[PDB]
Every structure is written in C-alpha cells, then in structure tokens.
Design a protein around this ligand. Structure first.
Ligand SMILES: Nc1ccn([C@@H]2O[C@H](COP(=O)(O)OP(=O)(O)OP(=O)(O)O)[C@@H](O)[C@H]2O)c(=O)n1
Ligand SMILES: [Mg+2]
Ligand SMILES: [Mg+2]
Ligand SMILES: [Zn+2]
Ligand SMILES: [Zn+2]
Length: 621
RNA sequence: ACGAUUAUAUCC
RNA sequence: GGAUAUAAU
C-alpha cells in the first residue's frame, strides 16, 4: 500500500550514471531496509560521520552545581555515522503519508493559489545570476561531487572560478531546458548538533540532503528569488519572520497577542520535511504560473525533475562494511534544497490558514468540498485571509497562531489529513494553548517583558536554563579539552550576557568564564587562537557596548536611545520567573558555587597556565 | 570532507 | 565584503 512507485523515465539516467561509475561493486541487496523508498542498488563506500563529543573544560569546571542535573549532563553531539543516520531514516524518513482526501486537496490548491497571488502582489519571480551565486556561496561550501567529472576542485571558491565547472552546469542546464535531468543527485548526511543522549548513547537527529554545487546553482538560478527577494518577510507575507533575528521575535509575538482571539497555539509538527506530500510539492510549484519564458522552464525542471523525483545516495552499515544505497522518493522536502526555509514557511502558512478555516466552520468535511463551500472559502480568503495571516508568526515548521476563537484547538481533520501530524499529542487530542504570550515557545525560545530601571521595556529571549548550560559544556570533537576551548567558552559567555543577561546564574557564570579565560586570546576557530599582545578581547566595557548596540541603539522597539551606563543597571527577571525557567537560585549548591566562585576561577586559571587574566566579576556586587 | 535560509558577535 | 564562532528553521 505504501511502497514507492519510481518514474524511471525521469530518474533513470541518473541511476545508470551512478551505476556506471561503480560497476565493480554495484549489486542489488535484497536485505535493504527501505520500506517506503524505491531502492535501486548499492556499492562499497567508506564510513563518514561522527558520534563523539568533546567536553569544554572551562565551562564544566565553572558550572559545578549542574553536574548533578541530567538535563545538562546528558547533552551530546548527535550521531552522524551511518548507524546514526539509518536510525533516523527508519524512525522518520522511511515513512509514508496517506494521500489527502479530495476535499483537502481542493482546500490546499485554492489556498495555495490565493497565497502565491498575495505573496506576488509586490514581488515578481525572477532568475538569479551566476555572479549572484558566486558572491553568495561560501568559499568552503560542500562541492558534494556525485560523479567523477565533478570531483576536480578543492573548494567551492576554486570551482566557481573555473570555466570548466560552468561547462558542467551548462550541459545540465541545457538538459533541464529540454525537460530532462541527468546529474542532479542528493548527497545525504546527518545533522551535527547538540541533542540529549539516552542510555549512554548519542542520538541521531535528522537527515541533511544536498545536491552537488552545480545542481545547487541550478536550484538557486530558478528559485533563489524566494530568498534573495525576501518573499517570506513579515512585510511581504504577513505571517513570516524571515530576516528578524531570534532576539526580536518576542516583539512579534507581543503584537500578535494584541489581536482579539483565543489562546496562542504553537503546535510543532513531527518531522515536517518527511510529511510534505506530493500535493504539497505540486502546490508549491504553482509559483511557476507567475513565471515566463526560459525561467518558467528552468523552475519547472527543478520542481518536477529534482524536487518531485529525488535520487538519493545514503550510507548504510552492513556486516561486510559500509555500503551506499541509491534510493528514490517522489515526495518529502529534501532538507537542503534552496527552497527549504521558504517553501516550508509557504506550506505551513497554507496549512495554518486551513486549520483556522476548519475552526471557523468555513468548510465542514475534508472528504469533499461542496461548490457552496468552495465559494465560502474563496470569499473567506478575500474577506479575512490577510487578517488571518497576520494572526500568525511562522518560521518554516515553527508557528504561533492566535486564532479567532478556541474552536481551533479541536479543528484537526484538515491538519491530520494534510499529513501535518502534531508532535507529542494524540492525533485527535485537542491542542494545548497558551493564554499568556510570554510563555509561548517559538524557535526554541519564549519571551519575557522585562522592565528596566528607567522604566523602559525590553522583550528578551529566554529558554530553560539547563538547555543553555548543557550546550555550552560540549562541542564537536572528542575527549576533553581546556585551553583549546577556552575562547569557545568565552564565546558562549558573550552570548549569555547579550541574550540571557537577565538570568542570574547565566550572568554570574558568564563573568566567571570570562574571568578564567586568558583575556588577550582571540578565537581564530573553535580550537585555535592568536594572542593580541596589547589588546584585551571583549572586556566588560565593550560587552556593555554590544549590549547597548543591540538592545537600545539598533532596537526598533526602543524609542529612547539613552544608553545604559553600567552592567548593574541592566536588570534580571524576577526571582520567581528566573526560577520557573530553571534558575538554581535558592538551592544551597548554587549559594556555595557563587560564594566561592573566585576559587573555581583561580583553579581554571592555574590549569590553563601563566597568562594575562582580567577579572570580569566586579561588573556585579 | 563539511545543506539551504537567517540573525548576532568578533576578527580581518 | 570575507572568515570564524554561536544560535535559529
Ligand atoms: N537544521 C535544520 C533544521 C530544520 N530544517 C528544516 O526545518 C524543518 C523543521 O525544523 P524542526 O521543527 O526543528 O525539525 P523537524 O524536522 O520538525 O523535527 P522535530 O520537530 O521532530 O524535532 C525541518 O523539517 C527541516 O526541513 C532545516 O532545513 N535545517
Ligand atoms: Mg517540527
Ligand atoms: Mg521550535
Ligand atoms: Zn538535473
Ligand atoms: Zn523564561
């Protein structure tokens, strides 16, 4: 029922080309685990990825009360080995979403058409240039070379400056213009990030899919305009937040909460990219209806031949050593495509609008839309669609919706039938809604209204303190380190004083870390540094300069631009709120840690060696 | 060898 | 503008 039906007239040449370069080892394993993906063959390969973690000695030594807290100490780097990847693959990528019902599809298509038109009122699809690509791509961006003709260069920078790289692009750009595709294949790797381990094992996290550099240009050429012209900015899309930094997102939530409506809902979707249906992809492609000429053909080539027909190359442990599987999947979002963020935001705006529609009873059944319901839907979009859009903040899969009323919480038949099944809740269990916008999660944070001593008001980002301390105590790599990650620890402290200055433990811990890290060191990478013989790196005073720059000078929501003169003027959350968000104030282990903080600082100093040190601790009493 | 999109800090 | 670091989807 759920097996994948490949279109070999479209993906056929790609698979043959991969096979041709690997005839020595190409077989057809009949023990392949793929249940929902078409499988095409395997061949020998070598293991890539990692599952180890390095300890950040300076931060661990300075956060002792948290040694006894498993929400801190179980933090690890993810497992990006093929073992780690196949786990994630069996858990979430190797799944199938049921085709939505005919009423759902009519609802999605109507809404997507109205959305593309609203997004396009003040923007125009356009091609992007090779010069634009050459200026944007990082010099060390992955080449991701699939075939040997593509493995000539040592960096993306070198590749983009060779006319031979652009000859490969031209060969394939010409195929796309005829409607054929021969080289656009996805690499696959696991996302390296920080995730809580369980049972002494580091966990995988997610799949990252990337085509080779030439195919990524071709993506960019046809579809980069969604990003480069900022289609999903809040100004253009009403719901998006593209371009707004994390720290300013609380200001958007406060404005959404000014609206009249029900609770504030922020239902996460479980494995959003794996739940993108071919219906979703075909509604996304409707942007080509606003294109012309050569552009329309290149976009359509990308959507049809590379997004709706993906050939993937993924590693897999097998008792005879690691192999590489050549699989294929017509739906899903390939997390790594140029459209990932933007089209995730698009479809998630479309899904939330529909859920709002269900809540208001515009339509009543997803099995079929009556003509009078199609009329009601279109007239609803015309009448209120733009206002319903502004009741949302949507950053790809992450969303906050303040609906008209709380019928939303139990309006789940369209949401579930589109595949957008909520995380950590039953299919038909009503949603949990916040009636206080400062408690709403959005992009892994919530936001507090912080009154300053002037009486001015900041909105500041905040999360459970154990997540922050956990992440600061580990890094990529292996084993233990002290000197090699001291500047990294100072980097974390700088983040803490700028974004979470309002948490007592974090502001104490940050000053302690700065007091312990040699003050003339400057990071040149995660594990390397240089010594400015006469400049101190990021003293107290220029940390306070950064704080005033971000929260006052450049803060559009701060009218009075009067600087703050002293770290002691910069306030904290109220104690109860600090505690509610994981503060250890009130615990005796923390009062001890604090009272004796200079001892631990002097201990780290001695372990690092004889260097010049500065005491950031008098910034607080 | 190291995805896309984006913010901030730093260094050049 | 680039690189690094961090963070977010
Ligand atoms: N490093 C990342 C993280 C996320 N995303 C995109 O943003 C979507 C939503 O991100 P998130 O909600 O953090 O992950 P999910 O895939 O939803 O996984 P889960 O919610 O199960 O943690 C992902 O599906 C992915 O397509 C991405 O491109 N790159
Ligand atoms: Mg999700
Ligand atoms: Mg989130
Ligand atoms: Zn192609
Ligand atoms: Zn908080």
């Amino acid at each position: 029922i759920e097996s994948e039906t490949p279109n070999l007239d479209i993906i056929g040449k790609r698979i043959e080309k991969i096979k041709q370069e690997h005839e020595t080892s190409w077989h057809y394993d009949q023990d392949h685990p793929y249940k929902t993906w078409a499988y095409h063959g395997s061949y020998e390969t070598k293991q890539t990825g990692s599952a180890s973690s390095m300890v950040n000695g300076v931060v661990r030594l300075l956060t002792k009360p948290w040694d006894i807290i498993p929400m801190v100490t179980q933090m690890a780097m993810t497992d990006t080995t093929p073992f780690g990847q196949q786990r994630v693959f069996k858990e979430k990528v190797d799944t199938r979403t049921q085709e939505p019902k005919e009423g759902t599809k009519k609802l999605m298509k109507i809404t997507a058409e109205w959305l593309w038109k609203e997004l396009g009122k003040k923007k125009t699809p356009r091609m992007c240039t090779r010069e634009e690509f050459t200026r944007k791509v990082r010099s060390n961006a992955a080449l991701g070379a699939i075939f040997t003709d593509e493995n000539k260069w040592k960096s993306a920078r070198e590749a983009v400056e060779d006319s031979g790289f652009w000859e490969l692009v031209d060969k394939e750009r010409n195929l796309h213009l005829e409607g054929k595709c021969e080289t656009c294949v996805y690499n696959m790797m696991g996302k390296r990030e920080k995730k809580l381990g369980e049972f002494g094992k580091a966990k995988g996290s997610r799949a990252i899919w990337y085509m080779w550099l030439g195919a990524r240009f071709l993506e960019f050429e046809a579809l980069g305009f969604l990003n480069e012209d900022h289609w999903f900015s809040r100004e253009n899309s009403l719901s998006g937040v593209e371009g707004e930094g994390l720290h300013k997102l609380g200001y958007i939530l406060r404005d959404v909460s000014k609206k009249e409506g029900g609770a504030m809902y922020a239902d996460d979707t479980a494995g959003w990219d794996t739940r993108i249906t071919l219906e979703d992809l075909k509604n996304e492609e409707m942007v080509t209806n606003h294109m012309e000429g050569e552009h329309k053909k290149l976009a359509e080539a990308i959507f049809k031949l590379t997004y709706q027909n993906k050939v993937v190359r993924v590693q897999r442990p097998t008792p005879r050593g690691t192999v590489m599987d050549i699989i294929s999947r017509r739906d899903q979002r390939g997390s790594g495509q140029v459209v990932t963020y933007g089209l995730n935001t698009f479809t998630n705006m479309e899904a939330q609008l529909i859920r709002q529609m269900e809540g208001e009873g515009v339509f009543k059944s997803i099995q079929h839309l009556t003509v009078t319901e199609e009329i009601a839907v279109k007239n609803w979009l015309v009448r209120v669609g733009r206002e319903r859009l502004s009741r949302m903040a949507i950053s790809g899969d992450d969303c906050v919706v303040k609906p008209l009323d709380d019928r939303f919480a139990s309006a789940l038949t369209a949401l579930n039938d589109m595949g957008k099944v909520r995380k950590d809740i039953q299919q038909w269990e009503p949603s949990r809604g916040w009636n206080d916008w400062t408690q709403v999660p959005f992009c892994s944070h919530h936001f507090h209204e912080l009154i300053m001593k002037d009486g001015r008001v900041l909105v500041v980002p905040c999360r459970n303190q154990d997540e922050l301390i956990g992440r600061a105590r580990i890094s990529q790599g292996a084993g233990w380190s002290l000197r090699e990650t001291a500047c990294l620890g100072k980097s974390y402290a700088q983040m803490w004083s700028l974004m979470y200055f309002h948490r007592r433990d974090l502001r104490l811990a940050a000053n302690a870390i700065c007091s312990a890290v040699p003050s003339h060191w400057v990071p040149t990478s995660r594990t390397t540094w240089s010594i400015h013989a006469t400049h101190e790196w990021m003293t107290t005073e220029d940390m306070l300069t950064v704080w005033n720059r971000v929260w006052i000078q450049e803060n559009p929501w701060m009218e009075d631009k009067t600087p703050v003169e002293s770290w002691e003027e910069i306030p904290y959350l109220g104690k109860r709120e600090d505690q509610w968000c994981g503060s250890l104030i009130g615990l005796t282990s923390r009062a001890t840690w604090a009272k004796n903080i200079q001892t631990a600082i002097n201990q780290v100093r001695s372990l690092i060696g004889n260097e010049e040190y500065t005491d950031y601790m008098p910034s607080m009493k």
